[PDB]
Design an enzyme around this catalytic site. Structure first.
Site, PDB file in Angstrom:
ATOM      1  N   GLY A 131       0.890  -1.094   0.000  1.00 49.36           N
ATOM      2  CA  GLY A 131       0.000   0.000   0.000  1.00 49.36           C
ATOM      3  C   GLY A 131       0.923   1.135   0.000  1.00 49.36           C
ATOM      4  O   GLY A 131       0.615   2.197   0.510  1.00 49.36           O
ATOM      5  N   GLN A 132       2.126   0.955  -0.569  1.00 52.35           N
ATOM      6  CA  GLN A 132       3.132   1.955  -0.643  1.00 52.35           C
ATOM      7  C   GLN A 132       2.703   2.785  -1.752  1.00 52.35           C
ATOM      8  O   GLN A 132       1.661   2.585  -2.334  1.00 52.35           O
ATOM      9  N   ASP A 133       3.403   3.872  -1.910  1.00 48.24           N
ATOM     10  CA  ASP A 133       2.826   5.015  -2.506  1.00 48.24           C
ATOM     11  C   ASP A 133       2.131   4.927  -3.830  1.00 48.24           C
ATOM     12  O   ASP A 133       0.919   4.985  -3.842  1.00 48.24           O
ATOM     13  N   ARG A 148      -0.327   1.688  -3.879  1.00 43.91           N
ATOM     14  CA  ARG A 148      -1.585   2.119  -3.414  1.00 43.91           C
ATOM     15  C   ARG A 148      -2.281   2.990  -4.423  1.00 43.91           C
ATOM     16  O   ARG A 148      -3.462   2.815  -4.696  1.00 43.91           O
TER      17      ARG A 148
END
Lengths: 159, 427
Positions: free
Chosen positions: A53-55, A58
């Site tokens: 859910g990293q930048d 996500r």
């Protein structure tokens, strides 16, 4: 079914996964991307995207915006950090409609790993308390623990 | 690379298939090539044509041409082998001959170019074996069975968990047939910097824990005219210093003669480059060697220690300038009170030090003393640091004269000599 593991994966969110898959553990660099497995049950073979859910990742999942069928939320139960913030995000899933085609499981992972919240405490906190147009029984794991999981799931495909 | 493309050709004015090693342009390089090839330029026969330094290399094999292209020189045979070799390979690769078969096994064929030839290098032999390398493998399988299985076990188990929960020569011969003086303006064409550094540690008791002396003569010549010269070295030194000459320098000449010259007198010293012609070293425990002894005697008067420190110059030869003896002081106590002193002092509140400076220390004036009082303990006073510069070298070694190798005429030279302190401390 498309089953979704999101949050930032590399934390052992991915561990959580690797543990399922081989029995093993994160022996990868902490993993932003799609991790895929098919797990077969009711021989719906659940295709798991363990996705950070990293930048970007996500940020960008639109091709994966399609229609869901299963929910794992893999949890740092030491995180009790991004969850309100998460709740704030989470609404937009809620505001998605594809997203209402899954009877799910939030999985509390990383219990041994520091601690965890009231099963309830969390429940409001991600905003979880509030659903119903999808089922919503709750299941804790850890990432060095978790059982009865499958009860949760049992109901779930058989929703 | 030795080929930017291999294109396999059929008569059609068109080359049946091709691959572009490197993309940039468009086909017009390739496209143009194709056109030319189709045209053949009406030209009659000949399996090779290179024109305009471009090899167009081909082979008719039937109504087919297999083509390679290059521009700058090559060793032929190798090449041929390849064209021919192609002509061996295909019915295996893509099946026989007719475009289609190939059309189906395009992927196979292109793969073969790469495989065969890694950038103009003849990679192997053995076609079948060639199959082998990829999409035909072995390792992966070995791994898979075991692994897949292992996982599978975990899975199976899981299912339950889930479920419930001379010659050369001939030729060869035939064929063969403080500032120092900085600008060059203030230096002679022959200039030497003789620098020595001293590292010394002494106990407060006065014993010499360690003394190390290092020195070297650096030679610099501004004019090639001066290139072949010899330095005359005068050595008064009793200390037992070890001298080493530069590897280029004649060791025997130095030993017997005490002259510094190159092993090959015909050779010239470098111009406008420093050369360390000679170096020396002295390491010794013997106190007798200490250039300047320091005696610091703290004594505690009741409330308020009095410190008496003196120095004495051992080597009459030296003349020490800007001597500073730095003494650490206790803090919070206020400034030290100065009694009788030889020379002057500077008190630094921040540093908590008392710097004792001078007097000039000559053979004539060997010793001096300082007395002051401050509240403190004897330990507060150490370590004492000594700093000074000397124009004269510690080791009694000097370059008296310089002469030309040829004719031995005297030559003007200048010298800069410095003796510096790396560390001089009294524990």
């Amino acid at each position: 079914m498309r089953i979704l593991m999101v949050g930032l994966d590399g934390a052992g969110k991915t561990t959580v996964l690797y543990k399922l898959k081989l029995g093993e553990v994160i022996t990868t660099i902490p993993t932003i991307g799609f991790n895929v497995e098919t797990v077969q049950y009711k021989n719906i073979s659940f295709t798991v995207w363990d996705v950070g859910g990293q930048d970007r990742i996500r940020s960008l999942w639109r091709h994966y915006y399609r229609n869901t069928e299963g929910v794992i939320f893999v949890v740092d139960s030491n995180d009790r950090s991004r969850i309100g913030e998460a709740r704030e995000v989470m609404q937009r899933m809620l505001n998605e409609d594809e997203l209402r085609n899954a009877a799910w499981l939030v999985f509390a992972n990383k219990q041994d790993l520091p601690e965890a919240m009231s099963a309830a405490e969390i429940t409001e906190k991600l905003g979880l308390h509030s659903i119903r147009n999808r089922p919503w029984f709750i299941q804790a794991t850890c990432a060095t623990s978790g059982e009865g999981l499958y009860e949760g799931l049992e109901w779930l495909s058989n929703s | 690379m030795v080929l930017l493309a291999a294109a396999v050709c059929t008569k059609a004015g068109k080359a049946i298939v091709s691959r572009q090693f490197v993309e940039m342009t468009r086909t017009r390089i390739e496209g143009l090539l194709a056109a030319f090839p189709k045209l053949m330029n009406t030209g009659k026969q000949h399996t090779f044509v290179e024109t305009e330094s471009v090899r167009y290399v081909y082979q008719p094999m039937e109504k087919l041409y297999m083509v390679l292209i290059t521009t700058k020189n090559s060793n032929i045979l190798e090449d041929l082998e390849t064209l021919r070799l192609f002509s061996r390979v295909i019915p295996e690769y893509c099946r026989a001959l007719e475009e289609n078969e190939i059309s189906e096994h395009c992927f196979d064929l292109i793969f073969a170019f790469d495989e065969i030839v890694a950038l103009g290098y003849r990679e192997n032999v053995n076609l079948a074996q060639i199959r082998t390398f990829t999409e035909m493998d072995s390792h992966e399988e070995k791994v898979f069975r075991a692994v897949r299985e292992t996982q599978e076990r975990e899975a199976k188990a899981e299912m339950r968990r889930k479920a419930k929960e001379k010659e050369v020569d001939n030729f060869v011969d035939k064929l063969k047939s403080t500032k120092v003086h900085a600008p060059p303006i203030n230096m002679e064409s022959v200039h030497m910097k003789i620098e020595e550094k001293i590292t010394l540690t002494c106990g407060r008791d006065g014993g010499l824990q360690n003394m190390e002396l290092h020195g070297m003569i650096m030679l610099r010549i501004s004019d090639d005219k001066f290139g072949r010269i010899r330095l005359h070295v005068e050595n008064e030194d009793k200390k037992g210093v070890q001298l080493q000459t530069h590897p280029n320098v004649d060791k025997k000449l130095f030993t017997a003669e005490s002259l510094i010259g190159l092993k090959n007198p015909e050779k010239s010293f470098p111009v406008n480059s420093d050369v360390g012609v000679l170096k020396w070293r002295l390491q010794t425990t013997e106190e007798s060697f200490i250039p300047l002894t320091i005696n610091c005697w703290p004594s505690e008067s009741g409330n308020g220690c009095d410190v008496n420190i003196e120095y004495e110059l051992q080597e009459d030869n030296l003349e020490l300038n800007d001597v500073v003896i730095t003494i650490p002081l206790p803090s919070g106590v206020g400034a030290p009170v100065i009694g009788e002193i030889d020379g002057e002092y500077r008190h630094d509140s921040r540093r908590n030090t008392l710097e004792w400076c001078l007097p000039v220390i000559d053979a004539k004036n060997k010793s001096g003393s300082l007395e002051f009082s401050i509240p403190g303990q004897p330990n507060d006073f150490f370590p004492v640091q000594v700093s000074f510069i000397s124009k004269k070298n510690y080791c009694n070694i000097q370059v008296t004269k310089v002469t030309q190798v040829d004719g031995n005429s005297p030559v003007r030279f200048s010298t800069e000599t410095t003796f510096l302190v790396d560390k001089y401390e009294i524990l």
